[PDB]
Design an enzyme around this catalytic site. Sequence first.
Site, PDB file in Angstrom:
ATOM      1  N   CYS A 348     -29.893  -7.822   0.715  1.00 56.51           N
ATOM      2  CA  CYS A 348     -30.177  -7.161  -0.566  1.00 56.51           C
ATOM      3  C   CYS A 348     -28.968  -6.380  -1.069  1.00 56.51           C
ATOM      4  O   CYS A 348     -28.876  -6.099  -2.267  1.00 56.51           O
ATOM      5  CB  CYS A 348     -31.378  -6.200  -0.479  1.00 56.51           C
ATOM      6  SG  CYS A 348     -33.044  -6.936  -0.368  1.00 56.51           S
ATOM      7  N   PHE A 349     -28.042  -6.035  -0.175  1.00 57.55           N
ATOM      8  CA  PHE A 349     -26.904  -5.188  -0.480  1.00 57.55           C
ATOM      9  C   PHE A 349     -25.581  -5.915  -0.307  1.00 57.55           C
ATOM     10  O   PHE A 349     -24.527  -5.279  -0.406  1.00 57.55           O
ATOM     11  CB  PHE A 349     -26.917  -3.945   0.426  1.00 57.55           C
ATOM     12  CG  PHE A 349     -27.854  -2.866  -0.031  1.00 57.55           C
ATOM     13  CD1 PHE A 349     -28.777  -3.101  -1.042  1.00 57.55           C
ATOM     14  CD2 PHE A 349     -27.810  -1.612   0.549  1.00 57.55           C
ATOM     15  CE1 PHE A 349     -29.648  -2.096  -1.472  1.00 57.55           C
ATOM     16  CE2 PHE A 349     -28.676  -0.597   0.130  1.00 57.55           C
ATOM     17  CZ  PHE A 349     -29.596  -0.843  -0.882  1.00 57.55           C
TER      18      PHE A 349
END
Lengths: 374, 73
Positions: A348-349
């Site tokens: 997600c990052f």
Amino acid sequence: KRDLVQKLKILRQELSQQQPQAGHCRIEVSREEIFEESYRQVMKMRPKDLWKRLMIKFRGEEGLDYGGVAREWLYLLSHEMLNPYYGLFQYSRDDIYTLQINPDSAVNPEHLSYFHFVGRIMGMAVFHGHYIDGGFTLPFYKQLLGKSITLDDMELVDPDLHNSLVWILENDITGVLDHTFCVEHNAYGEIIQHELKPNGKSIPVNEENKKEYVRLYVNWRFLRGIEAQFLALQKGFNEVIPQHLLKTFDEKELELIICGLGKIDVNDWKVNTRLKHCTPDSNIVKWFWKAVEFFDEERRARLLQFVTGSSRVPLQGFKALQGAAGPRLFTIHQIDACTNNLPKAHTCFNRIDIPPYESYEKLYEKLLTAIEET
Amino acid sequence: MLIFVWTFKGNTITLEVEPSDTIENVKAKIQDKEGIPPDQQRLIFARKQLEDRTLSDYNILKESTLLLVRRLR
Ligand SMILES: [Cl-]
Ligand SMILES: [Cl-]
Ligand SMILES: [Cl-]
Ligand SMILES: [Cl-]
Ligand SMILES: [Cl-]
Ligand SMILES: [Cl-]
Ligand code: NA
Ligand code: NA
């Protein structure tokens, strides 16, 4: 390079006027059933509905951003619909990064609607500026553009047929070759014969119509067994992107606008990387780029897969990398952990967590183990 | 192994063969399946004539497809 920049501005212009000012394309799907629910909702819709502003929600989830959820939905969706698990596509022989239509797809009796569905999804990715999570051969993009398959494209799909057809064009077949405008192939333990043109069973191949024969027979050998499936997909696609909007694109350009950038440049990567708890001149960071520099293209694809969920990047490249909420550059995070751990990813990052390994060789080996293929 | 031949009639035989053979015996095997006498057979693959050598000589390999045309006395 520039000509593509102009072709893309023109496409964006025209896509823009095709979009209605009023209304929205509304999708609300559960995450566990993204495929089947997206299929039912999209196939209820008219072509014209697919041009409306996208407004996607995951069941039970408030998104950060409608554009973001849309980006995620197409990536997750296209990863399901292309997975050979559902029978519509398969991995190409020599390359697992290249999908092909599955000739045996009709075990799903409704399969043509699903190919039609897939076409619309690919078209919606183009129309709304998102990307598909997968990849096809260049002849597939060529057929999707309406271009015909060269003979040159046979040098991979069939070297033995490529050489025979070449020899037919090079030499005088008069008296030597009694071929007909009809062809036979092995379909389900059986031999089935197929006219390349009306009454081709009765049309001799000769020196005058040789070129036509080889052109029809190349085009046929690509579509062999997958014709109805390609037609249905191509209908769905051209329901979203009219075929004349892509007149001036070639196959390699269509692939970039549908799937993004496959060639990974290490310098563009280095330069658009953030560092957490490490520095540009620290060893963990030098070793990481040293390993990425040695990694071949397959290995670099897997590393990018591991850290981001995608082995491809946007056209703008690594500066344009997206995360969860909007953009997030690739991030190397040096973590305080035991040096026998593998690097862990936080897709997600676009973040990879790396322990303070003691040598380049340890990092090199532990990185390769982390990015092992599933 | 088991190479195939795309003949000048469009027929696409399957031929039980071996690299231990030589294309003369291949012609005999073609004389077997469809009975074309060796002296009016001309075999092509790699865009090139196969002089009366073995399959394991011309860079021919398994499950391949030669092109049989008509040699024309
Ligand atoms: Cl809704
Ligand atoms: Cl939009
Ligand atoms: Cl929202
Ligand atoms: Cl250090
Ligand atoms: Cl982008
Ligand atoms: Cl730990
Ligand atoms: Na638009
Ligand atoms: Na909901």
